[PDB]
């Protein structure tokens, strides 16, 4: 069996988004479809369930009125309609099969990420950084590559064809006020940095933007 979910979505606050979960390889009308929310912070929250064969639906107290479940029997698809949105609703939404009191929820959808933000698509603005002048130089030294003022996710940061991959730490993107950023620091031998060329690559599939800014000593 297989549960296929719709693609990623971006919506402005106050709008409504409808996402779908399509099931195949089993009797679609005879299984409940469970909708689960996972905010980036933590936790799995169950929104509710719908039985496509009938129109029966259940909602958790928190999401009553927020979500509306509908199902199409002709096409093995079920939908969840999210009402007026906010920044809080940004999360990854999952669909899963379920038959209460018997074999339970062994197949899940891949997940569908929903992002609520007033921002528009922005290209990455990578500003490579180098060690400060007022700092001692030793054998072990870190490197720096900063990407900021970009939207939406994801943006992949990697060195020149993986010139030096191990020893890097790409930190999760965060919003300063409205746009995402990213920090990636790696370590290289002091005797090799001024000799070997090391640079960070930036890719933005949504914006089709590729950047390559080498870092040189201050």
């Amino acid at each position: 069996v297989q549960l296929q979910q719709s693609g990623a979505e971006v919506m402005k606050p106050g709008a409504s988004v409808k996402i779908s979960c399509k099931g195949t390889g089993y009797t679609f009308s005879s299984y409940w479809i469970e909708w689960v929310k996972q905010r980036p912070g933590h936790g799995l929250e169950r929104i509710g369930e719908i039985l496509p064969g009938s129109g029966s639906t259940n909602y958790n107290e928190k999401f009553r009125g927020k979500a509306t479940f509908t199902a199409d029997k002709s096409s093995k698809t079920a939908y969840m309609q999210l009402s007026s949105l906010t920044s809080e609703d940004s999360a990854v939404y999952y669909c899963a099969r379920y038959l209460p009191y018997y074999y339970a929820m062994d197949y899940w959808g891949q997940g569908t990420s929903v992002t609520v933000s007033s921002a528009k698509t922005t290209p990455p603005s990578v500003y490579p950084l180098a060690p400060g002048s007022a700092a001692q130089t030793n054998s072990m030294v870190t490197l720096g590559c900063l990407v900021k003022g970009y939207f939406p996710e994801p943006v992949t940061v990697t060195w020149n064809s993986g010139s030096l991959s191990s020893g890097v730490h790409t930190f999760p993107a965060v919003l300063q006020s409205d746009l995402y950023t990213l920090s990636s620091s790696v370590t290289v031998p002091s005797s090799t940095w001024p000799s070997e060329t090391v640079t960070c690559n930036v890719a933005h599939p949504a914006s089709s933007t590729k950047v390559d800014k080498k870092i040189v000593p201050r």
């Binding site: 500003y127 490579p128 950084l129």
Partner: protein, 218 residues
Amino acid sequence: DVLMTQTPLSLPVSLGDQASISCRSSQSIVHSNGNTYLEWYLQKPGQSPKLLIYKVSNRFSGVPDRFSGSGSGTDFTLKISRVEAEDLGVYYCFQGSHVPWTFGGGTKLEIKRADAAPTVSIFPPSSEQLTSGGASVVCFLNNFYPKDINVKWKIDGSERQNGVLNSWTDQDSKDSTYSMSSTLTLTKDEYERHNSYTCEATHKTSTSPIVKSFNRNE
């Protein structure tokens, strides 16, 4: 909605050790047919959850036998005999006895090992940042363990907190360490006026807080 409380919030255990996770219910979740419908799910990072145990006495197919379950009317626990690298993730308890059905809080699982001291670094802004009209002050704390980390932004003898970004990285695999990258966005008018910036951090390995600073005036 039946509230399910899961403890501990985190569980560090070295490889091969016994792991115990407990899930408690706000009400009795027994069912008339002699079964109690409690299920345990594992969600490794970047993936949809998976089914491990249902009807705790029972166990799903295709799962290692080291997992086991037990409990009674309102208290249940899950046990992992021998821990392995693939067993890292977040474990949730799910009750399927009273409508609506609710997930557990979640019990993240880590692996404990010989802790390591932090390696701090500071990167002042770059030429591009200066030209743009800003100043990106980033202090990097790579390969440190455990989470007992607190970073204070002290500058020229004054502690600044506004504009302080907090974003760490999940536990690694090769090093099983943690990394911290906190950033302080500064403007040209404000960046130059300060003379000295310090990156202040504390950790359990070294009771005396560590210090790292540089002077703009050079």
